[PDB]
Amino acid sequence: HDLKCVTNNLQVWNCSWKAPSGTGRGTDYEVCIENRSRSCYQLEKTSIKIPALSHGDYEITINSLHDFGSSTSKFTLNEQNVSLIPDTPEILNLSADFSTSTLYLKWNDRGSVFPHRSNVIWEIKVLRKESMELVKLVTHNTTLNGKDTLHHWSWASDMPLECAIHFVEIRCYIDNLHFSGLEEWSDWSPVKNISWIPDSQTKVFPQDKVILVGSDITFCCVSQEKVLSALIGHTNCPLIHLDGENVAIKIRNISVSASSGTNVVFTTEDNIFGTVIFAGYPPDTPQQLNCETHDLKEIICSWNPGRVTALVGPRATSYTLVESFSGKYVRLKRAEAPTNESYQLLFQMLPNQEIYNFTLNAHNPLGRSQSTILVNITEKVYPHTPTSFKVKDINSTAVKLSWHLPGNFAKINFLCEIEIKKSNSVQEQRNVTIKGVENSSYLVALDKLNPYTLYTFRIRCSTETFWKWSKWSNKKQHLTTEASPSKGPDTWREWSSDGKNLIIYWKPLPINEANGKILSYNVSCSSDEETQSLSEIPDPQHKAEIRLDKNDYIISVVAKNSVGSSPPSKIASMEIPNDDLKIEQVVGMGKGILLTWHYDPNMTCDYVIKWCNSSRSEPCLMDWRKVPSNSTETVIESDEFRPGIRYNFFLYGCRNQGYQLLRSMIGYIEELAPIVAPNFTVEDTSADSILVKWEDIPVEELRGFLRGYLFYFGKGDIKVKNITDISQKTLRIADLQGKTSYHLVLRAYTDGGVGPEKSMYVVTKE
Amino acid sequence: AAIGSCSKEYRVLLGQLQKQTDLMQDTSRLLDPYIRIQGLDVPKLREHCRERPGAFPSEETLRGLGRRGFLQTLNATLGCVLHRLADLEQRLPKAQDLERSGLNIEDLEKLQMARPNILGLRNNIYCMAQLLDNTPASDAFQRKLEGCRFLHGYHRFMHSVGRVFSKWGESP
Amino acid sequence: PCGYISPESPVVQLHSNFTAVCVLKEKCMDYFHVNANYIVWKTNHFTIPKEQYTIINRTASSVTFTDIASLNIQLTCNILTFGQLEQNVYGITIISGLPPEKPKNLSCIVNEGKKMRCEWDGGRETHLETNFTLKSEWATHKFADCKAKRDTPTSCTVDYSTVYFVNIEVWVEAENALGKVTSDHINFDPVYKVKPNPPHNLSVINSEELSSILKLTWTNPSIKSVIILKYNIQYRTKDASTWSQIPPEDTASTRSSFTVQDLKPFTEYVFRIRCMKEDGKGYWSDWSEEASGITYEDRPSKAPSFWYKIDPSHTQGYRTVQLVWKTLPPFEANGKILDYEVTLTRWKSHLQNYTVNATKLTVNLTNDRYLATLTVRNLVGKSDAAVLTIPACDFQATHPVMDLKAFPKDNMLWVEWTTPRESVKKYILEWCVLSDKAPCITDWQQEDGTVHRTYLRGNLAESKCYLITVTPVYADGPGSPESIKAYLKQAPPSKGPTVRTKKVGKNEAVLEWDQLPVDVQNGFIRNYTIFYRTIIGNETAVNVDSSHTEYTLSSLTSDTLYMVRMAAYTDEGGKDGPEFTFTTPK
Numbered sequence A: 001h002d003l004k005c006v007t008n009n010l011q012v013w014n015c016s017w018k019a020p021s022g023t024g025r026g027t028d029y030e031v032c033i034e035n036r037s038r039s040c041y042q043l044e045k046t047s048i049k050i051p052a053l054s055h056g057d058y059e060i061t062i063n064s065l066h067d068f069g070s071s072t073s074k075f076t077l078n079e080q081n082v083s084l085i086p087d088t089p090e091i092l093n094l095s096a097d098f099s100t101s102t103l104y105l106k107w108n109d110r111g112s113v114f115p116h117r118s119n120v121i122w123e124i125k126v127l128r129k130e131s132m133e134l135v136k137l138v139t140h141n142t143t144l145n146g147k148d149t150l151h152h153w154s155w156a157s158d159m160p161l162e163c164a165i166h167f168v169e170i171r172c173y174i175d176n177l178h179f180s181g182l183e184e185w186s187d188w189s190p191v192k193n194i195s196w197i198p199d200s201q202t203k204v205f206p207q208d209k210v211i212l213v214g215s216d217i218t219f220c221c222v223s224q225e226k227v228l229s230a231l232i233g234h235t236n237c238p239l240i241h242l243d244g245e246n247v248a249i250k251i252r253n254i255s256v257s258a259s260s261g262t263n264v265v266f267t268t269e270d271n272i273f274g275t276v277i278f279a280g281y282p283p284d285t286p287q288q289l290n291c292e293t294h295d296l297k298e299i300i301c302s303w304n305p306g307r308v309t310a311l312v313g314p315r316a317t318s319y320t321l322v323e324s325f326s327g328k329y330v331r332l333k334r335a336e337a338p339t340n341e342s343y344q345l346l347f348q349m350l351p352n353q354e355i356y357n358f359t360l361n362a363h364n365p366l367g368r369s370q371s372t373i374l375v376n377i378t379e380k381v382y383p384h385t386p387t388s389f390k391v392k393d394i395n396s397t398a399v400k401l402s403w404h405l406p407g408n409f410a411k412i413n414f415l416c417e418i419e420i421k422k423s424n425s426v427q428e429q430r431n432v433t434i435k436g437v438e439n440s441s442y443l444v445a446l447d448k449l450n451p452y453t454l455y456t457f458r459i460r461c462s463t464e465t466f467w468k469w470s471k472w473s474n475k476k477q478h479l480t481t482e483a484s485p486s487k488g489p490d491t492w493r494e495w496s497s498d499g500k501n502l503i504i505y506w507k508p509l510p511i512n513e514a515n516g517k518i519l520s521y522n523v524s525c526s527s528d529e530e531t532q533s534l535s536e537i538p539d540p541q542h543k544a545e546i547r548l549d550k551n552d553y554i555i556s557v558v559a560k561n562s563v564g565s566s567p568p569s570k571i572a573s574m575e576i577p578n579d580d581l582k583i584e585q586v587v588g589m590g591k592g593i594l595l596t597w598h599y600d601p602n603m604t605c606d607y608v609i610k611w612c613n614s615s616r617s618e619p620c621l622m623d624w625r626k627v628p629s630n631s632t633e634t635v636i637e638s639d640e641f642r643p644g645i646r647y648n649f650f651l652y653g654c655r656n657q658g659y660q661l662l663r664s665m666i667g668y669i670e671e672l673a674p675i676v677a678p679n680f681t682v683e684d685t686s687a688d689s690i691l692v693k694w695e696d697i698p699v700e701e702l703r704g705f706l707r708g709y710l711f712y713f714g715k716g717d718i719k720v721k722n723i724t725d726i727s728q729k730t731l732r733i734a735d736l737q738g739k740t741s742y743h744l745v746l747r748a749y750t751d752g753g754v755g756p757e758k759s760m761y762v763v764t765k766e
Numbered sequence B: 001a002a003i004g005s006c007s008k009e010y011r012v013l014l015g016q017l018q019k020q021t022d023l024m025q026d027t028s029r030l031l032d033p034y035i036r037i038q039g040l041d042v043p044k045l046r047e048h049c050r051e052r053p054g055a056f057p058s059e060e061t062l063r064g065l066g067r068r069g070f071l072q073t074l075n076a077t078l079g080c081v082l083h084r085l086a087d088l089e090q091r092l093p094k095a096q097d098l099e100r101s102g103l104n105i106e107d108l109e110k111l112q113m114a115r116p117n118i119l120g121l122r123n124n125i126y127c128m129a130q131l132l133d134n135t136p137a138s139d140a141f142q143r144k145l146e147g148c149r150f151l152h153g154y155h156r157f158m159h160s161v162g163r164v165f166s167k168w169g170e171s172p
Numbered sequence C: 001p002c003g004y005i006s007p008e009s010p011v012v013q014l015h016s017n018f019t020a021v022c023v024l025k026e027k028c029m030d031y032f033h034v035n036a037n038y039i040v041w042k043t044n045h046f047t048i049p050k051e052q053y054t055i056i057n058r059t060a061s062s063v064t065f066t067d068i069a070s071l072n073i074q075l076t077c078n079i080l081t082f083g084q085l086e087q088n089v090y091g092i093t094i095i096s097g098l099p100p101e102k103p104k105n106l107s108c109i110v111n112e113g114k115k116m117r118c119e120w121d122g123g124r125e126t127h128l129e130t131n132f133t134l135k136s137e138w139a140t141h142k143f144a145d146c147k148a149k150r151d152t153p154t155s156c157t158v159d160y161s162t163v164y165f166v167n168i169e170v171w172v173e174a175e176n177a178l179g180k181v182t183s184d185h186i187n188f189d190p191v192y193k194v195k196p197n198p199p200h201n202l203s204v205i206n207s208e209e210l211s212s213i214l215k216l217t218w219t220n221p222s223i224k225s226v227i228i229l230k231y232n233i234q235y236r237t238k239d240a241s242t243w244s245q246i247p248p249e250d251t252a253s254t255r256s257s258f259t260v261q262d263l264k265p266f267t268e269y270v271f272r273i274r275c276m277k278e279d280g281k282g283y284w285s286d287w288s289e290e291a292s293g294i295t296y297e298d299r300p301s302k303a304p305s306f307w308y309k310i311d312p313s314h315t316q317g318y319r320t321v322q323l324v325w326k327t328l329p330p331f332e333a334n335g336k337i338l339d340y341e342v343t344l345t346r347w348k349s350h351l352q353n354y355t356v357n358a359t360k361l362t363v364n365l366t367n368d369r370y371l372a373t374l375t376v377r378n379l380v381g382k383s384d385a386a387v388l389t390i391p392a393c394d395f396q397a398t399h400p401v402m403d404l405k406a407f408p409k410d411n412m413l414w415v416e417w418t419t420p421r422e423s424v425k426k427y428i429l430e431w432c433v434l435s436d437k438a439p440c441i442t443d444w445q446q447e448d449g450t451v452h453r454t455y456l457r458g459n460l461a462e463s464k465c466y467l468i469t470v471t472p473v474y475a476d477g478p479g480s481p482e483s484i485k486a487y488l489k490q491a492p493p494s495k496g497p498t499v500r501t502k503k504v505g506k507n508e509a510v511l512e513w514d515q516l517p518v519d520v521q522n523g524f525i526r527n528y529t530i531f532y533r534t535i536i537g538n539e540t541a542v543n544v545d546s547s548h549t550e551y552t553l554s555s556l557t558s559d560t561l562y563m564v565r566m567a568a569y570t571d572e573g574g575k576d577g578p579e580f581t582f583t584t585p586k
């Protein structure tokens, strides 16, 4: 009375019905379908397999064949009433990876059963914890094409497989758009488990893994004896009781590993077991990757790794540099450099190749990094430090240099900078260009310099590309040539006290004029008929005597050097007398004293003015200065001028080969008003006259030539009586009255001002 | 050039030997730095760093041995400990990594000072002998325990040889 | 080029044998038609003669030098072509040839936990470089070597750690371009050359119970366990710079603490310490940092000084008597003075005690006999009582001292006197400066009765008259006071005395002058002089004693003007006064 038909291939409908009440075993049934062609069969059980009919309602009449009567019942079955129950799947092979703890499943879909395309939905179920548990459930959709296709499925586990047994189950559920009936899920496949043989060679899993800092990792420990706890360094961890005596722990956001690694141990009754975990970081991008060369033969490239990888020893990050155009690669050895030169690698150049496209690749057991850069080997050359710098002389006004430069620079040129460092001057620099050669010494000579001067030479050179400057070479000190005379010294002659000997004085030539060390002086007092008294006096003697019988001899003082002689300085020895001489006074304005004289047209050669100290009985330290005839007013600059010291100035005239004295002037470097008034005292006083006497003021406090005294007197209507007589030290006043108090005031005055005054009160006698 | 015996005074030679042994018997100088630098600075793990039987000769054997055999055994033991110490130095990390992790380089300094101490002890033993004229693969955590056991056995042997040296005062 | 002088760059020793050979090629030979017979030698100073060089063959010539005493010699070989023409070929030079000598003074020093450094001396000058290298090796092991650096060729630091208790043999070998030579071979124990580190963190700890002990604490170096070391402690006060050294017999063992003794009174001390090996082999370490420390104070007691003074203004029934005492010196007080306690006890009557925090206390006193005591209080208690009896109003002071003398010695006045026949107890000295405008500033000092000659402990001023007053102190009361005048350092007077005429006669004149004030005398005036002269006549002098204030002039002429002057002389000198003028009547 209840007919439920099922189908597993969309072609043959397996309809099953219930047996009527009262029908015993061995009952014959005559069941068929009312269709276009009535073809009924005979079967023995209550399960008939009929083909797939068309869309519509069909009449099914059952006939229970018995020996006591027959039963006839009708049923109406449609496509919407038949349930779709596909066959259960079957696992073909089940494999599991032991190193990575990854499962593998293989199963056949049996596509040849269905002729039309249909969407198949697979549901894989992963089990473990043999008592009971459920972990994973992932959906898988496939497509049927009338052909049996073998599918593959993989999944990685988090817990080591050596600590638990797993189970695998999978079912299917097809989707047929042409089937208007009910679609049911297929039954679950027989359980296919994977089992591991407990050989128990170690205890803790895993062993020396390399994981990133911040990930999840689950440890386990298989043991047959009771355990106590688990420790990660100094921190504890909660235990998870697995099957048997096995325990597990969970670690979330693991910290950075140490040098020896974060040893995770499992303490027991009498022993202890544990392994080491290594937590690291991905490799950082190589920063500051700049390759250059030093001699156009090798390419030395350095880079900064930046953030550390936290992995050393047999798991350190290895660097690999490979060429792009040539494919040549190089690998760094285990021996690494200290932090100052953390990473550097040499690369051999390839001939007739200038463009380089380097690609450095780093790799660790955690990841990999790379970096690309295009470098021109001809623009990134480092000029090597020049060596063997030597200095060689050529002549008086030139010197030659030489230095060596290793490398094959025969195709490029050099721009070498020569620094000229003269003692007590400004630093001088010179630039010179030279064509580069292959492993040879370059020689460059310089000129236009002052002779007799110590110099310090150091050179640094760079290429024409102007990429980097070479280091400064070692400084070399060398001396120039002997000397080079330019002009003659200033000379002056004087006569002795006996009127027979003629002493000669001359000043040493300066460095800018002599341009060298003076060796000797060639003095000669010769007449117009014969050269006589040719003597040579050496340094530092700047005076010499030569006996002369007549006054028409000319003096030619010539300084002697190592190369030649100085230009001769001629000076006359005849002294024309001059009886019209007058003493004059001069006032020094500041440091120098001005000299004023009228222009004389008869002067021939120049003017000479001499001066010395007139406040000493010792012989003077006479100094002179030649002034041309076109000048009429000059000043004398000397450090020997001191306040309060009188200097006698003598002006000589060059008239007809003879020095004739013109003016004799005396004065001081400074002249002003006196600082103190002359002290005066009363000696005698009458009823109608008084007497006063002042002391002579010394020249140290007078500060000039005293012109006189200004004596003031009046009742205390005052009278002023000037006394211009410098020798008159006595003063008397007549026409005086008695018993009157007078105020006597004495004040000195000079050309540079009027000094102070002294006063006193006295009463005249009766 | 080089003399046969580095010293000719038996008294000062024996004094040098005794002082060297008393200096090298420093547990806090040798063993504790190793356990501190190996990350095993916990009492539970320190309780297991003990000497295993059959690693170093016994005090009874050292007392029963004579003089030349004693010197030869000490020479062979010093050679073996030098080889194992070279292996351990190959195993230990670098000073920069120690400073980065937070450890101290004093342990490495003490080891690199104790190795020349072993060399000098061997040289002094040679001087005395001339003067008298008569496991495929191991675990990273297992290697540390092996180092503990080896160093403890070495310290026990050093204590034994120190007691031996202190036993006999003088000898003709 | 056609020739070359062999060797090219020779460096021969000074004053030695040398031979130069200039060999030519056949090119110039068959070009100029010359040979070795035309080869001449010319130096940078002169031409080598013919008898000095020997011809080897047709194309070789050799010259010799028997003595090289020049630093640079330019030897050039030349050829003689046709026409007396000379052509240069080649030139050489010899620079700085001299061998060195072996070194000495081999000494090595070892530092605490560092490498061993050895030094030596360079020796005589050789004008050349010499690489000094020392060889250090054991009896069976060889170490590395050191190369002599250019900065200092007498210093080396080895590259291996110092292994103690190992006798090593070290010797320096001198090697140059002319031979090798080794120094002496020495063997030594590196522990015997250890220079210990100076002790650090030195602290000084005093004590609360005792006042003469200091607990010194310092830090010992790390080599204290290897070898036994001794110490040397040098201590000194804050005012004295001399360092007192503790005997090493007490610090000859390993220790980190020591106690110094015999420093009683309130003194801060500075300590320093060094250390070396016990047996004295090696070098002493540096001196430790100077650490300060104050000891505990002791509180002894000394005897103070006390004196009383009575004012002339006596009240009807009571007298105002003031009590004054001097502060105890630091060596006698031995602590901070707290207060003064003075007790006044009459003849069997009530007792009166007063606490004074100053050095002066005046009280209303009656006419009876009193006994005053002085007891200064300190941190531990009180000192002895200064006994001094205050006499009554009717008590006559008798029994004075004898032989009053006062004269300066060593820029200091010393007053000596003969002690009276009675049993004197104490002595008091009162002195003040004399001045017609300022009163006396009574300064006093107390000394024992056993000494009869003392000095005034005070800041005395020169050119001042001091009136010293001494009074003997008996058991009943003070004696009769005696006064005496003196000067610290006499000086000439500042102004002379003024004279005046009392009566002028026909041939006689009487003068008069007043005594100079004590503020302008500046000494003891011995005698006076009068300088009377004439406008035309000569100046005469006359002597007169200081006890006389008038004088007379005899043999005077009439109708003449006379000018007089008077000066006051002292032991140092005198100064003339104002001139006076007077006429003589007819």
Ligand SMILES: *[C@@H]1O[C@H](CO)[C@@H](O[C@@H]2O[C@H](CO)[C@@H](O)[C@H](O)[C@H]2NC(C)=O)[C@H](O)[C@H]1NC(C)=O
Pocket (backbone or CB within 6 Å): A130, A193, A194, A195
């Ligand atoms: C786990 O898998 C193992 C095999 O890997 C299963 O053991 C099989 O059990 C059946 C029925 O008992 C036997 O016919 C086989 O011979 C066994 N295979 C062997 C011994 O290799 C085991 O039943 C599965 N389930 C569990 C819970 O262990």
Ligand SMILES: *[C@@H]1O[C@H](CO)[C@@H](O[C@@H]2O[C@H](CO)[C@@H](O)[C@H](O)[C@H]2NC(C)=O)[C@H](O)[C@H]1NC(C)=O
Pocket (backbone or CB within 6 Å): A324, A357, A358, A359, A370, A371, A372, A374
């Ligand atoms: C430089 O050489 C590389 C080969 O290593 C060329 O190929 C490039 O490689 C990088 C690797 O970091 C890739 O990112 C690029 O996409 C690659 N480019 C090409 C075109 O393949 C690279 O092209 C070369 N540089 C130049 C400028 O050609």
Ligand SMILES: *[C@@H]1O[C@H](CO)[C@@H](O[C@@H]2O[C@H](CO)[C@@H](O)[C@H](O)[C@H]2NC(C)=O)[C@H](O)[C@H]1NC(C)=O
Pocket (backbone or CB within 6 Å): A354, A355, A376, A377, A378, A379, A465
């Ligand atoms: C790489 O460097 C070389 C050398 O500097 C460059 O060659 C130069 O090219 C310029 C063209 O502007 C010429 O004027 C120079 O004479 C060349 N120098 C020589 C031949 O030595 C080359 O162009 C550079 N290449 C790149 C890609 O930068």
Ligand SMILES: *[C@@H]1O[C@H](CO)[C@@H](O[C@@H]2O[C@H](CO)[C@@H](O)[C@H](O)[C@H]2NC(C)=O)[C@H](O)[C@H]1NC(C)=O
Pocket (backbone or CB within 6 Å): B072, B075, B076, B079, B126, B129, C140
């Ligand atoms: C001590 O052991 C060593 C083995 O290391 C023996 O061999 C000596 O080794 C040193 C190493 O520098 C050599 O210098 C010696 O020449 C070696 N000796 C011989 C005889 O070859 C050494 O012999 C042992 N010492 C004793 C006293 O037995």
Ligand SMILES: *[C@@H]1O[C@H](CO)[C@@H](O[C@@H]2O[C@H](CO)[C@@H](O)[C@H](O)[C@H]2NC(C)=O)[C@H](O)[C@H]1NC(C)=O
Pocket (backbone or CB within 6 Å): C016, C017, C018, C064, C065, C066
């Ligand atoms: C170098 O040559 C000179 C010159 O021929 C010689 O020097 C002689 O040296 C000896 C030994 O000191 C002296 O006794 C002679 O007086 C030196 N002169 C001569 C002319 O014989 C000698 O042939 C060489 N000198 C040396 C030191 O070998």
Ligand SMILES: *[C@@H]1O[C@H](CO)[C@@H](O)[C@H](O)[C@H]1NC(C)=O
Pocket (backbone or CB within 6 Å): A252, A253, A254, A255
């Ligand atoms: C990082 O680890 C710490 C424990 O070391 C934890 O408290 C924290 O939550 C972790 N952070 C993240 C984002 O997981």
Ligand SMILES: *[C@@H]1O[C@H](CO)[C@@H](O)[C@H](O)[C@H]1NC(C)=O
Pocket (backbone or CB within 6 Å): A394, A395, A396, A397, A398, A445, A446, A447
């Ligand atoms: C010195 O030599 C230089 C060569 O650079 C030349 O220019 C100069 O004229 C020479 N001077 C003399 C005086 O010969």
Ligand SMILES: *[C@@H]1O[C@H](CO)[C@@H](O)[C@H](O)[C@H]1NC(C)=O
Pocket (backbone or CB within 6 Å): A438, A439, A440
């Ligand atoms: C420089 O090197 C070249 C090689 O190209 C060589 O021929 C030459 O002799 C060398 N020069 C010197 C001075 O070493």
Ligand SMILES: *[C@@H]1O[C@H](CO)[C@@H](O)[C@H](O)[C@H]1NC(C)=O
Pocket (backbone or CB within 6 Å): C023, C056, C057, C058, C059, C060
């Ligand atoms: C001459 O002596 C010189 C010495 O160097 C050498 O050329 C050769 O030995 C001799 N030559 C001839 C041609 O005899």
Ligand SMILES: *[C@@H]1O[C@H](CO)[C@@H](O)[C@H](O)[C@H]1NC(C)=O
Pocket (backbone or CB within 6 Å): C105
């Ligand atoms: C060695 O040098 C030391 C310097 O400390 C000094 O005694 C002297 O210069 C030398 N002594 C001897 C004995 O050579």
Ligand SMILES: *[C@@H]1O[C@H](CO)[C@@H](O)[C@H](O)[C@H]1NC(C)=O
Pocket (backbone or CB within 6 Å): C200, C201, C202
């Ligand atoms: C001793 O004191 C010093 C300075 O007060 C200081 O370095 C430290 O406290 C002590 N010294 C040492 C080395 O600890």
Ligand SMILES: *[C@@H]1O[C@H](CO)[C@@H](O)[C@H](O)[C@H]1NC(C)=O
Pocket (backbone or CB within 6 Å): C337, C338, C339, C357
């Ligand atoms: C007063 O006594 C106190 C003691 O408490 C002390 O300051 C000193 O002795 C006295 N003060 C002065 C200012 O003298």
Ligand SMILES: *[C@@H]1O[C@H](CO)[C@@H](O)[C@H](O)[C@H]1NC(C)=O
Pocket (backbone or CB within 6 Å): C352, C353, C354
């Ligand atoms: C002295 O008198 C005072 C009264 O203020 C008293 O306190 C003290 O005890 C007295 N001293 C003695 C020794 O009697």
Ligand SMILES: *[C@@H]1O[C@H](CO)[C@@H](O)[C@H](O)[C@H]1NC(C)=O
Pocket (backbone or CB within 6 Å): C315, C318, C320, C364
């Ligand atoms: C105390 O002395 C003062 C000072 O002269 C004066 O009043 C009188 O002599 C005394 N007065 C009393 C009340 O004792």
